[PDB]
Design a protein around this ligand. Structure first.
Ligand SMILES: N[C@@H](CCC(=O)N[C@@H](CS)C(=O)NCC(=O)O)C(=O)O
Ligand SMILES: N[C@@H](CCC(=O)N[C@@H](CS)C(=O)NCC(=O)O)C(=O)O
Lengths: 183, 183
C-alpha cells in the first residue's frame, strides 16, 4: 500500500485529507523532524531535500505535496485524461503551492497580494460551488487546504469574502477533512 | 503557434527558453505590468489572478509557469508516459516553484534553507550532467532558471558548490537560453 512520510502539523495532513476523500488505505510513517531524522541518510534516500511529505508506492518514491496530490488523482482516475485536462489541474496545484501560499503567508507581500487573491477567488467561488465547477476535486484539496490554514496560522478571517468563507466552511465540515486536518 | 504572454524581466522568459529548446515557434505578447495591463479585463480573462506568464494554444489557455512547462513537455513527448514518469517531472517543477525558490529568495529563511538546498543539488549534479541524468530536460529549465537568477538578484555565487556552478554556467551558454533569458 501507499506509505506516507509525515510529521505532526505538517503538509502531510493535506495528503491524508485526499487519501480520506479517495477512501484509500495507507501506512503513516512518522519522521521525527524535531530530532533531525529527516536530515539522515535513510530519509534523504526518499527525499534528498529532507522535507515531508513524501510517499513510497512499492519501489516508487515521490516528494512535494503537490506532486503527490496529482499522482494520487491520476491513479484514481477512471476516464483517461489528455494533456489539457491534466494541465488545468496542474495549474491549480502550482497556484496553491506558490502564488497563493506566498501571497497569503509571506509577510512582506501579504498586504498587497492577499486581498487581490481573495477578490479573484471570490468571483470564481461566487459562480460555482467548487474551483473546477459543480464537483469537488483534488484542486479543492490543494487550494482549500491553504485557505483553511489562514484562520489557523494568521488569526485572519474571510468575513469580507462571503463566497470564499462559505467554500472554506463547506470544506472544513466534510467528514474526510475532519478526519485529517481538522482532527 | 503557441501565444506566450510575458513582460520584461519576468518568468515568461523561462517558457521562451523551453520553447527554443523544443525548436517551437511562438507569438510573444508583452503585457505592460508597469501600466497595469495585467489588471485589465482582457488579461484577467486569461489569468484571473493577473500574473504572467500565460499561454494560449488555440482556444486553450493556461497559467502558472510550472503548469505551462509540464504542458509543453507532455505535448512534445514522443513516447507515452504513465503517472509515475509524469509524477517525477511534476515533483521537480513543484520543487522549483516552491521549496527551491522560497529557500533561496526569502530573506527570513535563506540562512538555514539555502546551504541545505545547494548541498543536496551539489550531490545530484556531481553525479550526472543534468538533474534527471545524462539528458537535458524540462526539469533543468525549471530548476536551472531559479539557480541562474541567484547571482543576478542576491549578488551571491556558487563558489562553494562547484557542480552547481558548472551546471549553471553550462545552461547560461546554451543557444536557447541565450535566445531567451540571456537576450
Ligand atoms: N513545497 C513542499 C514543502 C515541504 C516542507 O516545507 N515541509 C516541511 C514540513 S511542513 C519540512 O519537512 N521541514 C523540514 C526542514 O525544512 O528541515 C511541499 O509542499 O511538500
Ligand atoms: N507562480 C507564478 C508566479 C507568477 C508571477 O509572480 N508573475 C509576476 C511577474 S512580474 C507578475 O505577473 N506580477 C504581477 C502582479 O503581481 O501584479 C508562476 O510561476 O507563473
Amino acid at each position: 500500500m501507499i506509505k506516507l512520510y509525515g510529521a505532526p502539523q505538517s503538509r502531510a495532513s493535506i495528503i491524508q485529507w485526499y487519501l480520506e476523500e479517495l477512501s484509500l488505505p495507507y501506512e503513516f510513517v512518522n519522521v521525527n523532524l524535531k530530532e533531525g531524522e529527516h536530515r539522515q541518510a535513510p530519509y534523504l534516500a526518499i527525499n534528498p531535500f529532507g522535507k515531508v511529505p513524501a510517499i513510497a508506492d512499492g519501489n516508487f518514491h515521490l516528494w512535494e505535496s503537490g506532486a503527490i496530490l496529482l499522482y494520487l488523482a491520476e491513479k484514481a482516475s477512471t476516464i483517461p485524461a489528455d494533456a489539457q485536462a491534466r494541465a488545468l489541474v496542474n495549474q491549480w496545484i502550482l497556484f496553491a503551492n506558490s502564488t497563493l501560499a506566498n501571497g497569503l503567508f509571506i509577510e512582506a507581500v501579504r498586504e498587497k497580494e492577499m486581498p487581490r487573491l481573495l477578490q479573484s477567488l471570490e468571483k470564481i467561488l461566487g459562480r460555482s460551488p467548487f474551483i473546477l465547477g459543480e464537483k469537488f476535486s483534488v484542486v479543492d484539496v490543494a487550494v482549500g487546504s491553504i485557505l483553511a490554514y489562514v484562520p489557523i496560522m494568521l488569526k485572519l478571517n474571510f468575513d469580507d469574502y462571503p463566497a470564499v468563507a462559505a467554500y472554506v466552511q463547506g470544506l472544513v465540515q466534510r467528514p474526510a477533512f475532519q478526519a485529517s486536518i481538522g482532527a
